[PDB]
Amino acid sequence: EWYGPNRPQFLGPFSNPPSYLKGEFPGDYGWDTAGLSADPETFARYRELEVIHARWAMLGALGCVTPELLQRNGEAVWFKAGAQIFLDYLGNPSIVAILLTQLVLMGLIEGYRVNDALYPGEAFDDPDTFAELKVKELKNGRLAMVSMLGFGVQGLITRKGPIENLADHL
């Protein structure tokens, strides 16, 4: 029910989708008010960027959530993480070396990725449930982007861990 004219839009009953958002790609909720994806190539690049951002935001949200929650259950804050290296894993016993190693490994893997690119499958893994999982991935990714934006803005303005702010709400 997420594909075709019966798809759920971002405004609900108000059905005014753009011409180029003809409910074909996953999550086509018909939201383009600035017309930033009129060109099909621009749409393809934007889709790839959105998916990659979704996966990275998922990983970042999980990696920011885990430390402080583990601390409460037995610096822990998400943004004060790289300051410890001036770093034993889980408290269990040179920046240049790690920098070059991470850079070279990341360059290698991303060059391999560049050379379906968006959905390779195979070594990293009914088409109906496959499309359902694609839509679910896209929604979880959008939620992750919103959560990461909120987390960053709170770190800037409150200088405290996000879960600490949640506990102080509660």
Ligand X SMILES: CC1=C[C@H](O)CC(C)(C)[C@H]1/C=C/C(C)=C/C=C/C(C)=C/C=C/C=C(C)/C=C/C=C(C)/C=C/C1=C(C)C[C@H](O)CC1(C)C
- Binding site residues, as ranges? 31, 37, 50, 53, 55, 84, 90, 94, 102, 110, 136-137, 140, 142, 154, 169
131-160 binders of ligand X (CB under 6 A): 145, 148-149
Residue number with CB closer to ligand CLA (27 or 162): 162
The three-state (H, E, C) secondary structure of 20-57, written as one string:
CCCCCCCCCCCCCCCCCCCCHHHHHHHHHHHHHHHHHH
Residue number with CB closer to ligand X (135 or 145): 145
Angstrom distance (rounded) from CA 145 to CA 134? 16
Q: Which residue's structure tokens are 């989708």?
A: 17
Binding residue count for ligand X, defined by CB under 6 A: 17
Residue nearest to ligand X (CB): 60
Q: How far is the CB of 23 from another protein (least distance, A)?
A: 18
The annotation places the binding site for chlorophyll b at: 55, 94, 102, 110
- CA dihedral sign, ordered 155, 151, 66, 111: negative
Q: How many CB atoms lie within 10 A of CB 142?
A: 16
Residue number with CB closer to ligand CLA (44 or 103): 103
